[PDB]
From a paper:
In humans, [name] carries out 3′ end processing of both nucleus-encoded (nu-tRNAs) and mitochondria-encoded (mt-tRNAs) tRNAs. [name] is self-sufficient for processing of nu-tRNAs but requires [name] and [name] to process most mt-tRNAs. The [name] tetramer forms a base to which [name] is anchored through its ‘adapter helix’ and, together, they form a platform that binds the pre-[name] substrate through interactions with all four [name] subdomains. [name] folds into two β-lactamase domains (N-terminal domain (NTD) and endonuclease domain), which form extensive interactions with the pre-[name] through the acceptor stem, T-arm and 3′ trailer.
We, therefore, recapitulated the physiological order of events by first processing a pre-mt-tRNAGln substrate containing a 5′ leader by mt-[name] P, followed by the subsequent addition of ELAC2mut. The structure of mt-[name] ZGln reveals how [name] recognizes and interacts with canonical pre-[name] substrates. The T-loop of mt-tRNAGln adopts a characteristic pentanucleotide U-turn structure, which establishes mutually stabilizing tertiary interactions with nucleobases G18 and G19 from the D-loop to form the canonical [name] elbow. [name] clamps the acceptor arm–T-arm ‘minihelix’ of pre-tRNAGln between its NTD and endonuclease domain. The first is formed near the [name] elbow and involves hydrophobic interactions between the [name] flexible arm and the [name] NTD. This interface is 1.9-fold smaller than the adjacent interface between the flexible arm and the [name] (158 Å2 between flexible arm and [name] NTD versus 308 Å2 between flexible arm and [name]), suggesting that the latter interface has the primary role in [name] binding to mt-tRNAGln. Consistent with this, deletion of the [name] flexible arm (Δ250–298) but not [name] NTD (Δ1–124) abolished the 3′ processing of mt-tRNAGln. Taken together, these data show that [name] interacts with canonical tRNAs primarily through direct protein–RNA interactions with the acceptor stem, T-arm and elbow region, while protein–protein interactions with [name] are not strictly required.
Numbering used by the authors:
A (entry chain F): 92 to 156, 176 to 385
B (entry chain C), D (entry chain A): 7 to 261
C (entry chain D): 8 to 202, 222 to 257
E (entry chain B): 7 to 103, 107 to 202, 225 to 257
F (entry chain E): 54 to 189, 234 to 401, 414 to 467, 479 to 792
Write the structure that this text describes.
Amino acid sequence: AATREFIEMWRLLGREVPEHITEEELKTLMECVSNTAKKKYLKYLYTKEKVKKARQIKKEMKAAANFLFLRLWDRNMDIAMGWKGAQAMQFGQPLVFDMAYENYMKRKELQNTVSQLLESEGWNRRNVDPFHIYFCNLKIDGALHRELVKRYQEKWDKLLLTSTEKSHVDLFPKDSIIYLTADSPNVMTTFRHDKVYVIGSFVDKSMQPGTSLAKAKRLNLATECLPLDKYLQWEIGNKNLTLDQMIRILLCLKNNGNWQEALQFVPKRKHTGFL
Amino acid sequence: SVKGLVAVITGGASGLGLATAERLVGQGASAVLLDLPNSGGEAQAKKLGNNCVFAPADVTSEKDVQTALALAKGKFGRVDVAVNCAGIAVASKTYNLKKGQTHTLEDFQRVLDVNLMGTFNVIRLVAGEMGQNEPDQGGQRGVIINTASVAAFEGQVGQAAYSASKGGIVGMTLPIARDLAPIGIRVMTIAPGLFGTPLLTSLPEKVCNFLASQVPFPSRLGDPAEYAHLVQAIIENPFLNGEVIRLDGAIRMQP
Amino acid sequence: VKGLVAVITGGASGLGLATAERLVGQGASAVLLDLPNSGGEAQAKKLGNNCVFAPADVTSEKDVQTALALAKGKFGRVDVAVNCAGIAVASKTYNLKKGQTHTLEDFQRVLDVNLMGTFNVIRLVAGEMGQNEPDQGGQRGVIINTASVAAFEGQVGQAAYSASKGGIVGMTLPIARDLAPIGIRVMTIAPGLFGPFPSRLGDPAEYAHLVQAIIENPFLNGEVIRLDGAI
Amino acid sequence: SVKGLVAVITGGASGLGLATAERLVGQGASAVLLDLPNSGGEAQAKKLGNNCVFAPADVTSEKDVQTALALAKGKFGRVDVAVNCAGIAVASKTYNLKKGQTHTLEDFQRVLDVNLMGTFNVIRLVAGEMGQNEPDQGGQRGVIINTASVAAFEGQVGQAAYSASKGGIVGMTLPIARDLAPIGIRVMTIAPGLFGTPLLTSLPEKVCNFLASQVPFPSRLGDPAEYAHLVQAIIENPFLNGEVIRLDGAIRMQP
Amino acid sequence: SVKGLVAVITGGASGLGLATAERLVGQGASAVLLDLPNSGGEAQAKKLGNNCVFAPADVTSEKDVQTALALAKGKFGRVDVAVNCAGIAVASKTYNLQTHTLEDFQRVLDVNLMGTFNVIRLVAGEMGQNEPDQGGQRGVIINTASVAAFEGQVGQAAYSASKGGIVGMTLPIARDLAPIGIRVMTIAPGLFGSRLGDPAEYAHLVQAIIENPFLNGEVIRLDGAI
Amino acid sequence: GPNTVYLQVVAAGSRDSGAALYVFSEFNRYLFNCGEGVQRLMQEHKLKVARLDNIFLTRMHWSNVGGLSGMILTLKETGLPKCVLSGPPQLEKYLEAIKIFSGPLKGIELAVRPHSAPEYEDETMTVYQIPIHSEQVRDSSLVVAFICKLHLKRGNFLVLKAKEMGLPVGTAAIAPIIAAVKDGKSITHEGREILAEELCTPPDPGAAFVVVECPDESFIQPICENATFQRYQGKADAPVALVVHMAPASVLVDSRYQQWMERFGPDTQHLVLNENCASVHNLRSHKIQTQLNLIHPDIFPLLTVPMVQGECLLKYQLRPRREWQRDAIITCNPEEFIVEALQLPNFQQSVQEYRRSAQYPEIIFLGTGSAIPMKIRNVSATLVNISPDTSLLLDCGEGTFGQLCRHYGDQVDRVLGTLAAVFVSHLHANHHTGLPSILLQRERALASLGKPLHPLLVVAPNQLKAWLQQYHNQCQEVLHHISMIPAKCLQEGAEISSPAVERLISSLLRTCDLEEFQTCLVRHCKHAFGCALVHTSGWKVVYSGDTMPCEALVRMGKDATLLIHEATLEDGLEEEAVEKTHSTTSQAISVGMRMNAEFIMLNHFSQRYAKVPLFSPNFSEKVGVAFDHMKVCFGDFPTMPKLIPPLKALFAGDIEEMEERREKRELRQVRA
RNA sequence: UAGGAUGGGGUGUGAUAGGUGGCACGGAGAAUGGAUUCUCAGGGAUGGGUUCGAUUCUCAUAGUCCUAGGCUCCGAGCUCG
Ligand SMILES: Nc1ncnc2c1ncn2[C@@H]1O[C@H](CSCC[C@H](N)C(=O)O)[C@@H](O)[C@H]1O
Ligand SMILES: [Zn+2]
Ligand SMILES: [Zn+2]
């Protein structure tokens, strides 16, 4: 409550701080030694409140304004994607998300990683031929598992993916594993259906390079990088693409698309165009 | 071949009936469009040329169809093919405990009246007209083709009345085929899956894409010209009788 | 089936009556829903105080509604519904050697009694069944329909009858899917020649036995069972 | 009632065969578990007591099954019911263009031999034993129950060999009913689908949970005691013959 | 239409397979008669001209089918249609108050069902290499499963079992091959030689199935309502 | 005005690095020493030079202006339009002397702010220059001390109590209100007037810091008697926050000097970067020497009143909370260095294998890096120990004495006593600028060792005379320490110019004990010379210098015992080497077989090259490679080929790094 | 090795030394004539810092793009200072 009074003050000072604060987010607020970190956290809460209230307002404004099937709601589509997922989990090509990076990740990065995993899995379900997604090295009581169960709620027990505490080397023949990383010396020429691709679920905004390469070289796994430059002009943009863009690229190549079709999912702001 | 055949096509003003008429007239046949008087079939009959005539008749009524058939026999002297494409769809749950609504009886009755009873009302009178024909070489006098749906085997939620009617058509397809077999009239049933008829094209693009993706192969809504093609194939092939053909791309309807 | 309450459409005679006699013998409670002028009142007297006759024309919503209100008055709940009422007609669709056409009124009447009457009973008793407290298995009730094998291979002249029973056959699965979130099971029996092997006519008691088996077994749903001795 | 009947149950060491042995022995029927010697059949027979016997036999081999039937005849003197619950499965696609792999012919033929040929081998050898019974009242001499999973109707991807074998069992159900009718043996088939059988254990438990949730009602996997209940109902009821009964809670298979 | 297509027909030396080859070659297609060496198929291949060729193969073996498909790919460079007409039958009752012999059941089962799957799995290997046309189709696979699969007569237990297996496995194979772009269909021929079905009407139906792009995963009873 | 300002100690006064500060501010950046090795130290510790607007020199002395030429070249390469120097007015003459061996102010503009010029102020600092003349146009008794005064910072605005009188908060309308009160102007009559402290933090007048250099006792009294210092010292007007003293320890212990610091007040700090610091400056250099020592110990020997002793990277913030900051202190730990070498994939097994496989003169390679100094390699240098009493320096790059002092530690004084002659072969900014540092340290070493002060002998091109002559006349007396001999007089075809020259060269042979000394003209620039020495023992050493494969050199140096040749570039770019007049590896290697040398040594590696060049398969048992601080004896020639595998393993990453860079350049070319 | 350009982690874009405004599309969970309600994600590279308020103000780290070169001082005029 000392800090509750402190926030009342900064609010009395007229700073960007929220109207109210909950206990658990206050206990999160005290998780920041630097006063700048507390500032940025508070501005994040303030802006959340700001947009939440703005959208409630616009919601209140709009309120002033022989079929063959009953409306095919979101649930029916979800069940159809469920059946496709259940088939993929048996005969689909494996795709691995390699956990264990929980140590290297600040809270902001861990949250954003969870968000990207949620979107990537969403795009995976809708595809015509999904991968069989593995979460390896996924600590049961780690930070990520608790956030995933928080974000999915009771969906978590029902997702059609394999979650395990084992490593990927304990599941697949080590000759067939390929660790995808932008720093690889080997350039991916073609998508190979007999190999197992590993993606590190790791978000750090390009800030500690070589982590995936270090994990790969520590073992005797094969490694590859995407041929971004060879088939696409470049400009100012990181080469580590998001998880949902990675998965939508792999899903495009898997369906026999060519490179000039697969790289459409790269953000246009990063490159001028094809060569 | 179909050259010189005279066809009576119910529900011919749009959808599968129109596509069948367009094909048969294009292939050199003659067609009679059988549809409601207030429909837009008069324009289509002008489009197809003097081989085609529009007959305003409501298939639920004996007198309308009898007048239309008398017109057809006056204009062309014979009936060689009949295609049943008329019908209506209604979606409504039998009962919904959350909100307490119950399937109203009049929607069920009018679905049976248009789909199931209208079809039999057409079949018996057209079979009456074909029974006067001189038998073709091989004992055949004519062919009657019905349009069931995949809803007749795996109905989804809220299609109780529709599935009931199409299941009745499927059930009754065989005893009628046995009744008219001694006379030399062939009876066949086509069970189309998701087809780009006006019943489905009026839906939004999102649900249209979802329905198209549900088909295993080819992953698209059926094209009515392919229904017309199967109808022609049934007309040419002397040995298809008393059978239901699913034209659905191997799709199975999820609940 | 002890203490369970059933509404048996067409219970004055035939398969409905044989089901009521067997199930009440086994300790259930039965409501005979049949036409007012039927002789089912003697049967309801015969079965004792656990049985009640409710006069209702199945094609009319009001008659069935009042019969169900009578059931609510006597027993307070409905657990099982068995649909057996119906009639049959034999007539060829068209007969060139005699120039005779199947009349439309007969076709409409058979459809009225067999197919739409069954749906009318289902739609009303489901409203009654929805008031039950769920079984420990989650079940609220069971609905059983009768669609003879004529729905699959009809004889000459059964077009209207085969149409009605094929309608019921097509109707089974969508109603089962409709009522699944409510907890009502919908099942269909395909009786044959009821009064290769067994070569005799079927005994209605074997139909009653199957009805009890369907009631007891929690996992039979949305299926048609031909009980026809393989003819 | 089943009181005093002697039943031969193939695959009776586990799953549906064990559930059936449990019910009939509990109801007072004597049972013979016919299963491979590798399985723990003798442990279950010792557990179930004096009314249960384990017969080591391989269903694809004529001499083992003949020995097992001789053992049953020696112990109890007759066979009144036979239940075919033995079966194996394989999950392999017919052809896979992406991976460049083709279903092996040995795997298909092995599954086909165990599931389909073994079932006919048991039916044809048991019938030679059943043919010696003096008929029950009503012309019945014995009962034969088969197991043909719902894959025979709506088989999934990668289930071709299993679906082919169960489709054969479904196809030949009626022919055997016509074959054995003059001698008074009924043949019946159950389509259990998703059950408590370990075949639903090789799949990941999340797939099993999804499949259980997808059943319309009850939204769970079947309990083998419900299969045993249906088996007893089939044994008691004289008029079920040559028909396939789907026991799946109305679930319909999607690919 | 079917002009220019290459079709592989098993059991093409006689009966329905031969009548299908005659129709497709008359319509301008190319056909390969895959049948036993003693069937006399080389005379039929000589009759149909240079668009048709005979490849001796026993369908129950992988090697003979592989050699025949290699020969077809050498001759025409492509396979577009496969028709499975090969088969045998027996009429022995399961039990005769005598027991049905096991060798006859194994033989008819493997000739009808096992030969069909062996052909399907190898042609799909051949068919998977075609470029998909404007409709996305890579090939059509057509099977025979007599109406005995549905209403098998007395003594047709082995035959009905084999055709029932073909019927049961039609849909799962169609689902397997659907992402490849191969259509799978089944025909159920009835009484063939109010008269018996003429094999030319079966060949006509086969052509209709080849032409129509939307028929897939279905069994068609060509039985004249019997 | 800037919000944060802090100092940083780049060099702590150690004998091998000198002393230097670094004033950081948001708007400007400043430096106060430009001696030898300062450029290398600042590059190593990642100190940006992009916005180095001003450079302050506290004393005209080669120990303080040694690295000035290196900085000038670096600023020109950075693209800075103008740089301004401040210090003694003689800098202009110094700047004139720099252009003789370089270009004249190419592109960039140079300016000088002498002490007599008016004070210079900026948006962040006001600077005053104080001239101090020692007791008892070149002036050898002038030292300049700096006093920097910060700008006044407006106080913070108190918003919490601002609402009490009702001033608006959270809108741009308060911006003019805040500007007025922050400037000392009262806000107008908003129902009533509010002035100054009623809503605003009182202003901070600014904390000043002083940098003082006292090289000797002679300056103590002039510092004490200076009136300008008393202006800030004895008052309460913003008491100078910190005074940096750069003076030998003997000066600090004086009582008079000691009382002078104390009069600044109790709160004032005092930073001292004297000759008593004990801190490692070149961590990477220490790492490599420790790493290489695991291979061969002999070939790679190991290197060597309140007051605050200075350290490397020591800081002192000034605008924020005035506190001392120990966050960037360099930390040397040999255990970590050896641990990193042992964990290498292939390093460990190879060194075991090497050891199980198994004096004068000795060659020490002080410097092998080319034009610009880099992180690991200094500029060219080479020490030869002919006899225990004599030595010869083959090239004197900038900061050579620093590398020599680190290698030898406390023995440096004895070695310089043995220093007989220094050879200058071509007048490049990385072949000769280190000479003046050597002379002063040699004089100091001779004084400590008690040896007589005999002038050193320098053999060099005559153009070097003009550079030293101007520097000696204008800036600092040097020439009374040297007796210079023109390089042309030692040519094969030379003629006796004067009898005096002959006495010196004859003296050189007797002093250095050589049998004969010879020189030759290589083809690099105008007046570029090689050399060759033959001892009475019979061994011959030939030094090429910057060159390309030449024929005059081959005829003269036949059958040399050891040849040292330039290896700037590799085989990929022979055309660029010809254009830039340098030799590639195969060109040098081809030269060695033709010259028929016993052993071959390479140096002058390019800035492209980080640690090693490419070891082509043409590398035989006679061709070797050179690294900084290596020891080569005549007996180690058979050993040298065995060292190739361990050196490849120990530098796996960098050689891997160089290849990727070469690949990337190719990729950009390809993608063009 | 250096200098610059710049970084929207779902995608396009704004308010441009400080106050103002963001907009349009997309995703996850739970319920109902193609729309609705609740809930989740809403840090304009990462970490410090300043100001009454920072996306824009400053530093450090990392990614990415572009670019990285050479001697005259005077008269004798190949040497002389
Ligand atoms: N351009 C690219 N080429 C190959 N793999 C890439 C890629 N961009 C992203 N990925 C894969 O997707 C994941 C997220 S990108 C994150 C990069 C990584 N965490 C790092 O610090 O460098 C990575 O693990 C990488 O395997
Ligand atoms: Zn040079
Ligand atoms: Zn050089």
